[PDB]
Amino acid sequence: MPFERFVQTGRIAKASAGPLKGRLVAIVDVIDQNRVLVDGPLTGVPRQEYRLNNLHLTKYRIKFPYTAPTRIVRKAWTESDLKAQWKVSPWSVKAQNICKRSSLNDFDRFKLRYAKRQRNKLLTIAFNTLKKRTKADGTPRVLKKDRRERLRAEKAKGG
C-alpha cells in the first residue's frame, strides 16, 4: 500500500455520467462492489446511490461519519470547508476551464493568436548564450556583440 484510490467513506468522487455530471460528491456508505451511496449537498446533488462505474474517485479524503443522512453530511461538509478546497484544486479549475474552452465567442480566439506572435518574436530574440552546447563566440563584431549586449545593459553601442 503506497496508496492508490480507495472507494472510501469520505473519499469523494466527481461523477461523470449523470444529471449530476461534474458535481463533486462524497461517499456516504459502501453498498456492493458496483455501487456506493453518494451525497453532495453543497454541490446540490441530492442523495442517491450510484454506480462506481458512473463515478470515478478523487484524491480528497475527509474524516467522514460514514452512514450520515443529508443533514449531518451538509454539516460535515461545510465544517470541512470542502467546497473551498475543491476550488483551490487546480485540476478542478482545469475542469471549469473546459466549460470555458467551450465557444469563447470567436472574437476572443484571435485575441490569443494575434498577440501570441508578440511572444513568439520575443523567444527567438532572447536566444543563444549559456554554457551548454558551446557557447561562444568572439565575433566578427560590430553589430553582433552589440546585439548580445542589446539584451543586457543596453548602453552604448551599434556600431
Binding site: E4, R5, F6, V7, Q8, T9, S16, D29, V30, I31, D32, R35, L37, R47, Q48, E49, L52, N53, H56, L57, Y66
Partner: protein, 173 residues
Amino acid sequence: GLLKEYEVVGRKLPSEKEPQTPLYKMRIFAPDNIVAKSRFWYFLRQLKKFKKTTGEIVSIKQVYETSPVKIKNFGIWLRYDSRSGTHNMYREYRDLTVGGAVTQCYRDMGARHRARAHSIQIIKVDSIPAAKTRRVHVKQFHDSKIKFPLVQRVHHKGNRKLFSFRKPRTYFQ
C-alpha cells in the same frame, strides 16, 4: 428484463348460482403488465387448477418498492431448470431494489448455470435483517469499518480526441 414488481389477483369465473371463488394473489417480477398476468396463471396453476380463460383476471396492479434508497440485504430462494436437472438455490443479493435484486439475479443465474429466464422460477422474497446472512461475499459489506480500495479504472475511449496525443497513461499517480 426491466424488473417491475406486480400484485396480480385472479378468481376463476363468476356464476350467480355459484358464489365467490376464493381470490388468490401473487408478487410477480415482470417488465410487463401482461407478463405479470402470464407468470401469475402459471404459478397459480401449480397449486390451484385455474386455467385462463376458465380463469378470471381480476386486477393487475404494480407494487411500490418501500425503500429504494434503503441499503438492504435480500435472500431469494429460487428454483431453476437444468437440462436433465431441476434444483433449488438460496442466494443473497445486496441491492437497493427488490426489483434490482431480481434483475441482478436473472443475469447471475443466466451466467453461471446457463440459467434460462424461462427456466427460472421465483420462489420467495425476504429482506434479511441482521447476521442471518450466510452470504460470505455479502457479510463483507456489513463490516465495521468499511473503507475498501478502488482497484483499477476504466479509460473512456479515448477521450474527446479519437487521436489522444496525451497518452493514457495507466499511472494515475
